[PDB]
Amino acid sequence: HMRIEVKLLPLKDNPILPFNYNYEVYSQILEKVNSIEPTIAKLLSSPHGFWTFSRIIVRKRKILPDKGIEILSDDVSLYISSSNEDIIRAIAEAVEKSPEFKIGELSFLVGDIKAIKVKELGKENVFSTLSPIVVRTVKFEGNKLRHWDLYPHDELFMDRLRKVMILRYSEVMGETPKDRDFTIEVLKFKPTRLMVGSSYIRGSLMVFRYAGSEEIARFGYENGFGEKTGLGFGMVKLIE
RNA sequence: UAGUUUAA
């Protein structure tokens, strides 16, 4: 398990961060790890989800629903996480090498790059969503095959996430997970829709209590929960 | 930041 904080610096003044920055941040991270390691940057774009990143955390904010989030604080930080040590490596160097970010009209400098300590998984534990968890099912509109975004109150929901994890864990850990049973009781929730390119993505910010696997947890902890983790979704933090 | 606008 490896988790890092990347502190960012705003320029110029009265900085305003759009809410769907979500996609771009990932795009730029893919350029940056590309130049220095085109080979490891293939895992970044992998849909099977070898990593996660969080929202850009803004500690002092004024929320102005028209324009975006107001930055009142010196620096804002973003947290990348993953199970295999070598992606974090790539990104550390990659961004420290070309620390120029722009999301919409807000340009960014990479201030320091630290390493976050990983709070030891409990026996039974609780997670807050550090970036909205996504889960989807196939849905047909007439002829073509598109997908439909799920929320915890949809019933299929709990059942996709079981598949989505077991699928993902076998597809990276390389083997089937020993114990496949888990259940998550949902303590909080807010839905969100974020933009990517021309399309939309709906996912569930939420707090919740997970029980029933060492690895499914240790795994969802490192690489996040559900689908599309690579784009900045699924990352969780463990509060108790 | 138990939180972040907009609800196919």
Side-chain angles (χ1 to χ4, degrees), chain A residues 5-65:
Chain A
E5 172 154 49
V6 181
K7 299 251 177 9
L8 288 225
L9 195 116
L11 2 293
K12 173 70 170 50
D13 201 310
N14 222 38
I16 244 56
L17 178 85
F19 326 71
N20 309 38
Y21 52 67
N22 183 293
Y23 169 62
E24 266 171 302
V25 139
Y26 153 92
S27 323
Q28 297 164 115
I29 295 183
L30 198 62
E31 173 271 334
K32 274 129 182 45
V33 162
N34 205 21
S35 315
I36 89 140
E37 260 162 281
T39 171
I40 239 167
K42 283 157 191 145
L43 311 239
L44 294 211
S45 56
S46 181
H48 337 129
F50 294 109
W51 64 306
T52 327
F53 62 92
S54 66
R55 298 230 267 222
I56 282 141
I57 306 347
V58 172
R59 220 52 76 90
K60 306 300 209 181
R61 39 157 176 355
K62 198 151 141 72
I63 1 64
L64 45 115

Side-chain angles (χ1 to χ4, degrees), chain A residues 9 16-17 24 31 38 48 78-79 81 91 93 105 128 153 156 159 167 169 183 185 201 221 237:
Chain A
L9 195 116
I16 244 56
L17 178 85
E24 266 171 302
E31 173 271 334
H48 337 129
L78 128 58
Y79 297 66
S81 179
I91 304 137
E93 222 127 24
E105 290 296 26
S128 191
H153 65 77
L156 287 179
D159 200 41
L167 181 334
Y169 172 98
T183 12
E185 47 158 314
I201 291 272
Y221 197 179
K237 99 218 224 174

Side-chain angles (χ1 to χ4, degrees), chain A residues 24-174:
Chain A
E24 266 171 302
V25 139
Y26 153 92
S27 323
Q28 297 164 115
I29 295 183
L30 198 62
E31 173 271 334
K32 274 129 182 45
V33 162
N34 205 21
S35 315
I36 89 140
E37 260 162 281
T39 171
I40 239 167
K42 283 157 191 145
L43 311 239
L44 294 211
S45 56
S46 181
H48 337 129
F50 294 109
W51 64 306
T52 327
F53 62 92
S54 66
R55 298 230 267 222
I56 282 141
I57 306 347
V58 172
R59 220 52 76 90
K60 306 300 209 181
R61 39 157 176 355
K62 198 151 141 72
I63 1 64
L64 45 115
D66 278 345
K67 316 261 212 156
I69 305 156
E70 223 195 335
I71 290 72
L72 316 189
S73 198
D74 294 305
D75 41 79
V76 325
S77 318
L78 128 58
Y79 297 66
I80 285 85
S81 179
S82 153
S83 44
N84 104 85
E85 54 174 352
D86 255 74
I87 304 208
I88 317 307
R89 291 189 176 195
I91 304 137
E93 222 127 24
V95 331
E96 180 241 357
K97 293 228 327 73
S98 45
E100 329 90 355
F101 281 112
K102 173 184 55 212
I103 299 162
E105 290 296 26
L106 216 267
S107 226
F108 271 113
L109 240 0
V110 176
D112 96 11
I113 299 182
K114 275 183 316 187
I116 277 59
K117 25 166 92 193
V118 286
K119 219 206 135 192
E120 275 304 358
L121 9 39
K123 301 305 299 185
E124 189 200 84
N125 12 25
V126 173
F127 302 103
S128 191
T129 273
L130 222 28
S131 50
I133 269 157
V134 167
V135 188
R136 315 171 107 199
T137 189
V138 247
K139 236 273 300 180
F140 279 102
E141 230 73 45
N143 241 219
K144 34 165 309 187
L145 166 149
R146 223 283 85 101
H147 291 61
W148 189 261
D149 301 338
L150 294 205
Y151 299 110
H153 65 77
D154 294 344
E155 72 147 337
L156 287 179
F157 178 98
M158 192 46 194
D159 200 41
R160 287 301 303 135
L161 198 111
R162 301 224 185 78
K163 304 310 166 35
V164 191
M165 293 312 287
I166 322 230
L167 181 334
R168 262 172 86 232
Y169 172 98
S170 283
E171 206 186 350
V172 323
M173 264 33 170

